[PDB]
Amino acid sequence: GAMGSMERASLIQKAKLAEQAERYEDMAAFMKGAVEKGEELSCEERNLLSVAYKNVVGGQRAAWRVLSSIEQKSNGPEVREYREKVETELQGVCDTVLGLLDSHLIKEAGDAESRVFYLKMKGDYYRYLAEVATGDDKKRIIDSARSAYQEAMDISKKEMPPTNPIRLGLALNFSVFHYEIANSPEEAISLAKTTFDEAMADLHTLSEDSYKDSTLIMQLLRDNLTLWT
Amino acid sequence: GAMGSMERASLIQKAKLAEQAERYEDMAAFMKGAVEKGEELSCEERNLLSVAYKNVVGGQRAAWRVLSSIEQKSNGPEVREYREKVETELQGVCDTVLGLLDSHLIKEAGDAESRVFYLKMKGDYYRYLAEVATGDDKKRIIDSARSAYQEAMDISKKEMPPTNPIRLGLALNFSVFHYEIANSPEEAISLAKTTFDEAMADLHTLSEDSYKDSTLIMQLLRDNLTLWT
Amino acid sequence: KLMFKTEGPDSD
Amino acid sequence: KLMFKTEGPDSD
């Protein structure tokens, strides 16, 4: 692509600069260029990739929800056309992230920290597709999200402690997938409770900084449980 | 352009939808398409054009300032290259707005409300160019901003009451142009004081709603004077 | 729509 | 940089 001529280190440096400047579309393009160099990503670089696309897709989701709400209230073709435009752009961003994961981030990820990270991302971007999907397409997209989250959960349970922030963020997202995508609120509440309780019991093993990292995500599980129960 | 096939009314409707969705780049593209239909803009449509590009250029200015600050602290080519990338994009947005004003919004604007509005925009987008300009280019850009603000001020003083929100927003912006672009802080303070005092004396003529509109901008003149004196 | 807590930047 | 008050959306 357009980043083919730039050094991998220069693309990482510019991704960090774009983050400081709140230029998330540029940040995502720099990280897509870094991934396409073909080398595996470090933990910081995986985080840069994820923060970039999360901010990009976040703006699209927030816009899509405003438009869908106006369209539902209206039920001229303009509202539908514009909601479709934003939807197609959101789908394009998800297909881009999923394409990076499939070519070839996941297959080259052998360590649990990298493999769980990428599989959780795969679950998340299929979940964003499911938020805008309708009918049969929706069913298959939902199963793809479920499959990626499930594989990530299996690895996380075997290879990481229950306080691992990656394991905690995965369980949090899989719980929200269950609650509002899979229409399995009981599964969602069960997963959030078990995850919170198993992390609580392992907090005594952590340093002051690791404790802060784990408790931050546990508070998210608690916020959801408060609204669900 | 890409909006050539869409109805003018459809472009205005989609600009309003994009505003609700906080999709300002889309809002600007819809309004650029509406202007290029060749018809004059109503007051609401002029406001849609201005809010769209102000939000777009605002993100670019905020990013440019973060990058310029990092570059100055660093004094590798990456910081300079990326600050240049954002700068060129900001300059492109200003050239786009200035091109719409010059082809042919200003020449077709005969009423004071439309003519002052467009000339103030011309002043503002040359001011945004001046914020990033260096040396001799900077001098000519500064004179172009000054010339547009001056022509807008002359018309506003002759054709609008001192509480007119367009007249007030023009004087506010021209005052900031004087303070930090033209390095004329005394001119800035004089203009802000006179404008505030002349509007204060005309408030008694206004309805409850017009009073709210005028006092909102007068508070901005006061905020600047508080920091300047 | 009421959005539940998910991992990372709350960008929506 | 300290930015002074200007007309419309404070988008920067």
Ligand SMILES: *CCC(=O)Nc1cccc(-c2csc(C(=N)N)c2)c1
């Ligand atoms: C997995 C190990 C780890 O967290 N390593 C690491 C090192 C340095 C910086 C980061 C990091 C996390 S989020 C972030 C960002 N938004 N720029 C950077 C991670």
Ligand SMILES: *CCC(=O)Nc1cccc(-c2csc(C(=N)N)c2)c1
């Ligand atoms: C000059 C007369 C005037 O203000 N007319 C008018 C009518 C309806 C709506 C607006 C307006 C101002 S800002 C705005 C927006 N951000 N969408 C819309 C103005």
